[PDB]
Amino acid sequence: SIGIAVILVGTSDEVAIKDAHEKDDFHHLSVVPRVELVAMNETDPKSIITRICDLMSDRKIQGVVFADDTDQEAIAQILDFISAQTLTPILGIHGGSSMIMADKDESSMFFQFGPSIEQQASVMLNIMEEYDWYIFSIVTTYFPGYQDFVNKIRSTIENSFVGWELEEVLLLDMSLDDGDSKIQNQLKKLQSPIILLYCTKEEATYIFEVANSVGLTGYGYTWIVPSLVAGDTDTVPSEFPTGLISVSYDEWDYGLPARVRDGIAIITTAASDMLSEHSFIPEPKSSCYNTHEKRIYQSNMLNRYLINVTFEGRDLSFSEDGYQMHPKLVIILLNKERKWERVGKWKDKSLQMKYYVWPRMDDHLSIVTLEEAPFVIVESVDPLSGTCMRNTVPCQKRIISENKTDEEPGYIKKCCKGFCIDILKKISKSVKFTYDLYLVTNGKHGKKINGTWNGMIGEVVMKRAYMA
Amino acid sequence: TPTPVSYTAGFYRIPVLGLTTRMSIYSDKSIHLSFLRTVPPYSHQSSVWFEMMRVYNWNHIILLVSDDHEGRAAQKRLETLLEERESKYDNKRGPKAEKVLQFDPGTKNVTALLMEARELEARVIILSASEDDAATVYRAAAMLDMTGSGYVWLVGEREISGNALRYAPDGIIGLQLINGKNESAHISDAVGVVAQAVHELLEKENITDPPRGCVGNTNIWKTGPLFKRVLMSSKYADGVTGRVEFNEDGDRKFAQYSIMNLQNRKLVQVGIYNGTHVIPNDRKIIWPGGETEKPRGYQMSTRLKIVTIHQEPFVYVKPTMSDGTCKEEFTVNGDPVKKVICTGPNDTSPGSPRHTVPQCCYGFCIDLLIKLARTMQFTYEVHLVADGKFGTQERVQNSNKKEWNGMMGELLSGQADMIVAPLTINNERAQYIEFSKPFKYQG
C-alpha cells in the first residue's frame, strides 16, 4: 500500500532491477510496495518539477527513486530546496548528482550521499596507515568546505601515536591565472611524499599543468582527489598527471539494480519500522501546489527510522548531517589514460589491497633479519591501529610451514626497534637506500648442511637477501 | 523566500539584486552566487557598535547572543573588528570587551546569565540578536534590576517592535538607516546603477546573450560572470537617498545613517553617522538610569571569590564542628590556627552527590591570603573545587574543542578571579592566564 515512484534516467536495463527487488520475501513488511517504473528523458528540470506533482496525480506517492545523470550538480542544488519547500523524498541520487550537499534545512529529507568528504578524509587516514608516505603539504583553493576540513585534519593529526606530522597548508584561489610563478616560489612548501589537493577540476586541468611546469611532475602522479572532485573516470584528460588517487564513489560496483535494491527496500522497511513502533504512517498527497499548506502532519519523528534502519545485515544506518556512517568506498589508485584499475575494497573504514607493498614513479635492497635483544627487538603492532609507533619500523614475517593448500606469503607485519635498527636507519638516511625488511624462517645463523646453508645465509645463497 | 527564483538565476549565473531584505543567510555567496545587495545584511549594523567604541571611549561589554547564523556572523564581524592595534595607543583601555556568551533562541527567562552580568559590574547590557523576545529580555531585566543606573542600553534598527516599545525604558539608543523612501527613491537609484551597468555593457566587447530557452538548455550561458563583472565595475556617484559606491562584495556602503534615542516614548534623533564622521545632534543625552551624565567605563569593585583545591602541605582540610564553625586549635607557640571556613565541595565524599560542607581550612594558603587581604585591603570569598584536579587542555571530540579541564576552565570562564595552589607553570597556561612572580621554588 506504499506509493512508490521509480523514475529512470540512463541506459541500463530496468528489468535487471526488477528481480533485484522481486526476489525478496515481501511478507516481512506487512504492506505492499506499489512501485511505478516510469521512464524520463533528460529534459527541462522545471518540467521535472512539473513531473513531480504529475506523478503525484498519477498516484499518491510517498516514496520516490529517480536515476540520474553523472554530471548534474547544479540540479542537485536545484532539487533539495524544492523538497524542503514541499516534500520529504529520498534518492540515491545518482552519480555526480550524489554530491555531498550538506545544506541545513532538515525538511529536505534527502540521503544524497555515501560517506562525507570528511569521512573520505577519514578513510584517507587509513590510506595513510597503509602506505606511510607522509603528508607535509596541503593544497586547496576557495572550495567551500575547507576550513572544517583542515581543522578536522589538524585535530586528528595532533592525536596520533605515530610519527605523522603536518608542515604546510596552502590556500591560493586561482581563477587568478597570474599566480603560476607564485607556485614556482611555492615549490619549496610542497615537498611532501603525499599531498592533499582540493580544487575545481575545471581549473585543475590548467593548475596541474602549471604545477608540472613548476617542477612538481615527479610528485604530479602522487596527488589525491575524491572521485567527485575528479573528472569522469573514463577518458580522463592528460593535463592531469597519470596514476592518481581515487577515493569516493561507485558505478562498477553496487550499481543501478543494486542501488535501487538498497533503495526501495530501505524505504519499505523504514516505513514498516514506522509501522513497528508507531503502527502508523501519514498519507501521501496528490496536489503539490495546495498540499504544501498541508505539511502540518510533517511532525517527522519518522526521520529516526530514516537514518537508522538497516536491511538484511547490510549496515544501512545514516547520519542526518549529510553522510552515511557506514562505508563502502572505491579503489584507491585511479589510472588516467587507461581506465580505473581495481585495487582496493573498503569495509568498516578499512582497506583491502592485495599488494603488501606500494611502488611509485635508489633500489629496495632486500634484507632478512633475526630477533636478538638488545640489537633487534621484534614486538607486536599497536592494536588500536595495526602499525608501529614513532621510533619503530615495520618488519615482514610469514610462516608457511603449516600452509598446505595455499603455501605462499601473506605476511603479518610486526614492529621492530632496537640498537642496530637505528644504525641501519642512519645508513639508509646517509646513502639514500630503500629496503625490503623481512624475517627469517628456519635457522638462526643457519649452519652448513652438506654444503647447503640455512638461516640468513640461505637467503644470501639463494639471493633473496643482498644485505642481512 | 525568493530563493525559488534566484537559485534558478544561479543555474544560469544571471545576477539578482536584493532591494527589501537584510537577511544575512542570503549573503552566503558560496551558495547565493547570483545574489547582490542594494540593501546591506543584518550583520552590518554590528560593526557600527565598534564605531560606538570612541563615542565616550568605552572599552568593556558584556554580550549575549541568541544562537543564530546571523548572530554568529556578527560574532565573526566583531572578532574581526577587535583584532587590531598590533603595535609596535599604549594606555590600553581599548575595546578588550570582556565577554561573549551564547543563548538558545526561542527559550524563556530562566537566564541566570543576567545575574552573571550582575556579578561583573559592567556598565553595559548592550546587544541581543532578536526583537520579539527582547520584550521578555526587558521583563527579566526589570525582574532583578537592569533598568536603573550602572547599565547602558543600546539597540539597532532590527531590535524594534511595539512589544519591545512597550518595555524599552526612555533612554535606550537606537541606530536606524535612512530607509523609508527606498520603495521609490532607492528604487530609482538602483535602476540608475543598472543604467550605468548597461552604459558600460553596450560599450563593451563581444558578450554573449542569455538566450531564449530555459533550464532545459543546460549549458550555463557564459555571459553570467561577465554580467557579474559588469556589475562589479558599476560606480554610482550619488542618488536621492544619498549614495556611496559599492563594497568588495557588492554592498550598499552606508554613511546614510541616523541615530535616535527613546525619550518620552519616542525616537528623538540624536546625530548622524557619516562614514567616519560621528556627528551628534544638539539634543541632550537621556539614559534610563537617571543620567544626562556620561557613565563611561564600568565600575570596578570586587569581593574576591578565590577558588582553591585541597593539596597538602599547602592546604589541609578537616570536616567541620558541630555548629559548622571550627575548633580553636593552637600551634606549638600557642598561636591560633586562624582557619577560614572554606565552604567545601558539593558532591563531597566523591562518588556520592551530597552537598557542600564548610570545612576547617588551613596550611600555607590561609596565612598567605590573610597576609594578602591585610596588604591590599581586599574583601573576599572562599571557594573549593569539586573536581579534585588541576586540569589539562583536553581536546573535546565534540567539534574539536581544546578546553582546559577542571578548575582552570572555570577561571578561564571567570568562575573565579584567581587561584592559590601549587601552581605548575607551563607555556600553554601562560597564553591564556596572567601569572605573578614564582612564590615557591622546587623541583
Epitope: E106, L275, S276, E277, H278, S279, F280, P282, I296, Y297, S299, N300, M301, N303, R304, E320 | T107, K108
Partner: antibody
C-alpha cells in the same frame, strides 16, 4: 461532540461491546482509539484504529482480550471486550487523534464499565 | 521504554509561586521537531485534556501561568504564579515506541 457509551456491569471474564459517537469531522481522515483510566489512577490504552478501520494496535494485556472496530461513514466506534479482570472498573474514553496521529486533538468525558463480582 | 519519574508528585506549594516539576525519563526524546514529549491535564470530574504539545509552545486556552522546557530525559515544567483552581492531576508519560507508558500522576496541591 464526543460521547462514549455502551458500558454496563460485566462479570470477571465476561464480554461486552463499548461504543462511541463523535461529531465534528469525517472519520476516514482521522485515527481513533479507546483509552483506559484505572481507579488506581494510572492510565492505559485499550486500543487504537486506523481512519478506515484498518491498521490497529492492541497492547500486551489487550492481546488476548479486546477487539476494536470503527465505522468510517456512520459515526460509531465499537469495542468488544472479552475475558475481563477485576481491575477493569476503569473509565473508558475515545480521543480524536493528533495530527502526528499520536497524542489527541480533543477529548470526550467517557463512560464506565464496571467489572466486579 | 521512555519511563519517566515525576518529582514531586502530590506537591504542596503556596500561592503565587513557581511550581516547578522535574520530569526524569529513562531515555531521550529530543529531535529537530522541537521535542517528542507531550503532556496532560485533568481535573477530577472534569474530562482529561492536554497541556503541552512539545514544549512551552501550548495549544489554546492555557493561561500564562505555565512555562515548560527541558530536553532528552529531563523536563523542568514550571508554573508561574500559581492559584488554587488548577490543583489536580496531570503529566502523562509516553514512549515513541508502541508501548505508551502512561501514568506518573503529578497531583497538584496548594499550601492553603
Amino acid at each position: 461532540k464526543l460521547q462514549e457509551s455502551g458500558g454496563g456491569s460485566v462479570k470477571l471474564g465476561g464480554s461486552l461491546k463499548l461504543s462511541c459517537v463523535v461529531s465534528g469531522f469525517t472519520f476516514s481522515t482521522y485515527y481513533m482509539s479507546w483509552v483506559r483510566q484505572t481507579p488506581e489512577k494510572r492510565l492505559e490504552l485499550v486500543a487504537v484504529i486506523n481512519s478506515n478501520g484498518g491498521n490497529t494496535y492492541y497492547p500486551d494485556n489487550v492481546k488476548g482480550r479486546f477487539t476494536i472496530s470503527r465505522d468510517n461513514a456512520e459515526n460509531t466506534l465499537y469495542l468488544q471486550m472479552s475475558s475481563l479482570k477485576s481491575e477493569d472498573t476503569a473509565l473508558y474514553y475515545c480521543a480524536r487523534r493528533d495530527y502526528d496521529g499520536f497524542a489527541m486533538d480533543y477529548w470526550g468525558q467517557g463512560t464506565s464499565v464496571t467489572v466486579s463480582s | 521504554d521512555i519511563q519517566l519519574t515525576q518529582s514531586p508528585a502530590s506537591l504542596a506549594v503556596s500561592l503565587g509561586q513557581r511550581a516547578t516539576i522535574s520530569c526524569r525519563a529513562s531515555q531521550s526524546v529530543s529531535t529537530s521537531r522541537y521535542s517528542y514529549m507531550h503532556w496532560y491535564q485533568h481535573k477530577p470530574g472534569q474530562p482529561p485534556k492536554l497541556l503541552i504539545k512539545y514544549a512551552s509552545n501550548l495549544e489554546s486556552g492555557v493561561p500564562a501561568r505555565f512555562s515548560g522546557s527541558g530536553s532528552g530525559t529531563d523536563f523542568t515544567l514550571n508554573i508561574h504564579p500559581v492559584e488554587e483552581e488548577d490543583t489536580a492531576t496531570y503529566y502523562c508519560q509516553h514512549s515513541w515506541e508502541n508501548p505508551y507508558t502512561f501514568g506518573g500522576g503529578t497531583k497538584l496541591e496548594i499550601k492553603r
